[PDB]
Design a protein around this ligand. Structure first.
Ligand SMILES: *[C@@H]1O[C@H](CO)[C@@H](O[C@@H]2O[C@H](CO)[C@@H](O)[C@H](O)[C@@H]2NC(C)=O)[C@H](O)[C@H]1NC(C)=O
Ligand SMILES: *[C@@H]1O[C@H](CO)[C@@H](O[C@@H]2O[C@H](CO)[C@@H](O)[C@H](O)[C@H]2NC(C)=O)[C@H](O)[C@H]1NC(C)=O
Lengths: 399, 402, 407
């Protein structure tokens, strides 16, 4: 049967760490859950506030030659009269003596909907409550810019974006492969690429929240607190990626079932069925584009219309409204630790430890194998099995 | 099992290099892991803040006979009050009290987006195009111009662009091959039926061709500042970070345009044999379109995935929109290190190190150090892991089965 | 195996060029990287800053009684005060404040774009046209008006272009060939059906020829400056970069025009084959291959015609005329007479002859150094092609692969 959560008490309770004023704790989680059994919900480490064991050492260094930005994110003093909110709170612009001289002194340029989102954090297991640690609204007082050819609108390239390239690149693929001696496969893939981005490797400007949480992390391997940070910002960020939207469909039969369910010439005529049912529940995936267009696309195609070229074009236009990531290269978020931060490298190593422990703990091997065979899966808080090869039950108990 | 990725140890720390106030370590990627081995997402470089051993030998230097802007670029005095932005800045222009004589002296002339974006940086891995290292708003106080041609409008050619012709070409190739064979006959007897058709359609539009000046080039202030920040001692991770920020090459010339292609292939067979001694089907269709605006490109993508003969109006609409959204349909690569300016501190040493960094980057991300495909499929170095693909029935994460 | 490309060792460093503050190295391309080896993208030459070992022998010269502009060009005094910009940045005209006299007395004259672009630079490697090295905005104080001919608009012929004649020509050339056979017959026996068709169509339009002036020719300031900024010693990479930015030749004459072309070929064969050794075979193969090309003219008409051309559709002459008329707006250099770019290196310049010779030699080495000759042979005698930094061959038959290694 399903297995309920199994847990341990906190195995440790720390000293009242000097700058933190907390007695942190560590516990363990023994079994999240299995076969849809009751997930665990407790934190893998508690903590307690406490009067600190010693005076805090932060003694924070002022910006000095840099502008004394209200949030402490020191900036080139020239950026006080930026007119550009290089400080976190316009205190640059407010401390300018009403001497506006914005970047793109004469030119007209906008801010990209996408570049604000560029440099997505990613939990390799999930997704992050704050999409980016990058503050993609810094410009260092430049106005590098790219043109959307679809509108001739210029957008500023925010300083963390080392490259931005809008590019129409449509791809579509349709494949069928079928043997009997017996199998059938049908595949459809549709990629609407929209643009490349690349993130700067150096001098990145982060959100004040992120550097505050880096100050909140101790130089100790505060494993549970490091995990709490990591779930705030993911295991990696994306340093390059392709944005836009995609859809994907497959239809798969036995070769004998293909000939009965079939005429392949009618299937092609639907590409370029009304008497059949089993053609209806094809696999379908849509990502990006405004949900209305994806819904009506599904409602037509699952009812087995021919391919509505106009609905596909309308969804592609909707991708301009609701773009999504198509592919990325990831880099671990510890690379974002500012090199001048106190104990920066130590915190970076403790982050690498946290990452490795994250992988080690949430590997599916924490749960049992299925009661007969097939695939074991981990859902968040509980494992399960799936066995589509004519097996059944929450553990594939039946075949 | 598959083999997960693996990495070397870290190097020792470098010395604490002056001015940059850091020490560094290096860590080669031993294996990416074929067979869907666990990815190596992790950084090859490490760096730590350090108090330097000795005073900073300043990277900054004087510009005597040249106006030193607020950006670090020093320009000939003739370019002050030139009316053009010659520094990525207006420190050359905001000072100006009088006689802002523009070098295009009372003639109408536009910017060209072809010129502004010309010279794209390129990562040789995947040929991914990148922002141009050149500053294409600098005109050296000249007024070289040519016509956009299809419209009778002149645009000003930026100093970094030595040529930019606007030749209209249209090309289109259409090829079809079809084969059917039947053979009938140890004593051996045959019944076999084979059917193959190959249909290949590709068409090209050329918008123009640029060529880059390569001596006296003027580069973005960010790019030269990043070269200043680059360490002299070949800290490989920092050089790889630079190469990924800017790519390893720039297009020193290329054609802008737009492209589309369509392939249809079918093989169908019924093979049998008997003898005396003492069905499979594959179809695939792929349509690719590059450049032009979304609407027309994707409408053609639909109308080309259909076998319907396209309306020439749609083709011409896409062709026109290619002027709005061209693609670098071809380029000639030049190594990015040639853009490293002479007359800069350790510039030649940095060039040496950049060449070594490009070598190591190509090697360190070589698929060559991934295990073979089982059935000889094309081995793919994806992000941090290796795999292979096979066209034949042999299939799976290494084509292990069939 | 693939064969990774290979390069020479660096040459020795040159001496420091006393005026150029620089020293240089050369590096031959030993092997291009056949069979999709490593690409040899690395630079053929390298240069290093040097504090010079001796004083510069200055590159400036005294033009004497000639006006010496803000740019290095020197011009005869009468060209001052022309109203025409006879030098860089009107410096010949900013030298003038009173009694301006345009040689186009009492009239306005159009600037011809075809004259402005005439004298295209050319690189022999793909015959790509580069920009004209000529300064076609120099009239030398003349007002030679010519008609556009396709239009009555009169334009002032610039001094460099000795002739621009709208010697209009139009051509259409058409050929079709059709061949068909049916043949019916240890030993081998076969019966066959065979059909061959070829169709070839090209049309040319000529808008006119330019002839560049043999003598007294005035060049752009950047061109002459780039000849000044040249090592005087032979320095493979520095002259190669010059030829790469200007081309090894210029059109001393050329015809502007437009061109379209359509090729259609069909080959169809049917074979039946039976063999006996001291088998029965049936085969059908069809090959159908169509290519359509248009060059010049405005995109709208060029592409509309080219699509209507590619289809079996009969072209309405009105659209063909609209394209041929738009060729007046966007011509293409359909032909040229090539002169070596070093013939533009002006006599009466410091080391002029030596730089001529050095460019001659650099062009020699450039032809040689990027010669496909040193690629490996094709395995099936297909055409070896030098790509950017890698070399291969292609073959049209069933023998196929990156070197046609299989069939
Ligand atoms: C040699 O092979 C021929 C095919 O490869 C074969 O022709 C076939 O004959 C069938 C009747 O026996 C007929 O139904 C089928 O259409 C077919 N025809 C063609 C054009 O392929 C010949 O009969 C065979 N020769 C002998 C002597 O058996
Ligand atoms: C030359 O071009 C004209 C214009 O396209 C063609 O004129 C057509 O002539 C046919 C009869 O030959 C008529 O049926 C059409 O109505 C005409 N069209 C127009 C617009 O007038 C003419 O046919 C062409 N001739 C040749 C030999 O190609």
């Amino acid at each position: 049967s399903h297995i309920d959560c199994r847990m341990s008490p906190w195995s440790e309770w720390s000293q009242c760490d000097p700058c933190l004023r907390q007695m942190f704790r560590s516990r363990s989680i023994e079994v999240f859950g299995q076969f849809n059994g009751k997930r665990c919900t407790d934190a893998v480490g508690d903590r307690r506030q406490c009067v600190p064991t010693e005076p805090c050492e932060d003694a924070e260094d002022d910006c000095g030659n840099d502008f004394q930005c209200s949030t402490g994110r020191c900036i080139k003093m020239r950026l006080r009269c930026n007119g550009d909110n290089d400080c976190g709170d316009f205190s640059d612009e407010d401390d300018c003596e009403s001497e506006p001289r914005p970047p793109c002194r004469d030119r007209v340029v906008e801010e990209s909907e996408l570049a604000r989102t560029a440099g997505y954090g990613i939990n390799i297991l999930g997704m992050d409550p704050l999409s980016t640690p990058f503050d993609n609204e810094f410009y260092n007082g430049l106005c590098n810019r790219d043109r959307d050819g679809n509108t001739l609108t210029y957008y500023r390239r925010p300083w963390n974006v080392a490259s931005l390239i809008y590019e129409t690149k449509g791809e579509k693929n349709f494949r069928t492969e079928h043997y009997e001696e017996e199998k059938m496969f049908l595949h459809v893939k549709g990629e609407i690429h929209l643009g490349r981005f690349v993130m700067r490797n150096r001098d990145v400007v982060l959100t004040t929240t992120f550097v505050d949480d880096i100050k909140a992390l101790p130089t100790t391997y505060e494993k549970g607190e490091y995990f709490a940070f990591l779930e705030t910002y993911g295991t990696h960020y994306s340093s390059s990626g392709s944005l836009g939207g995609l859809y994907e469909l497959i239809y798969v039969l036995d070769k004998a079932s293909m000939k009965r369910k079939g005429e392949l010439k009618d299937i092609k005529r639907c590409l370029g069925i009304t008497s059949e049912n089993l053609i209806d529940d094809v696999v379908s995936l849509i990502r990006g584009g405004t949900r209305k267009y994806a819904f009506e696309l599904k409602e037509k195609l699952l009812r087995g219309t021919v391919i509505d070229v106009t609905d596909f074009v309308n969804w592609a236009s909707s991708i301009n409204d609701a773009p999504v990531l198509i592919s990325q290269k990831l880099s671990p978020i510890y690379n974002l630790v500012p090199v001048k931060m106190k104990n920066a490298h130590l915190k970076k190593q403790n982050l690498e430890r946290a990452i490795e422990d994250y992988i080690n703990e949430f590997s599916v091997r924490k749960c049992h194998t299925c009661q007969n065979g097939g695939t074991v899966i981990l859902m968040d808080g509980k494992c399960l099995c799936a066995c589509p090869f004519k097996f059944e039950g929450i553990a594939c108990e039946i075949s």
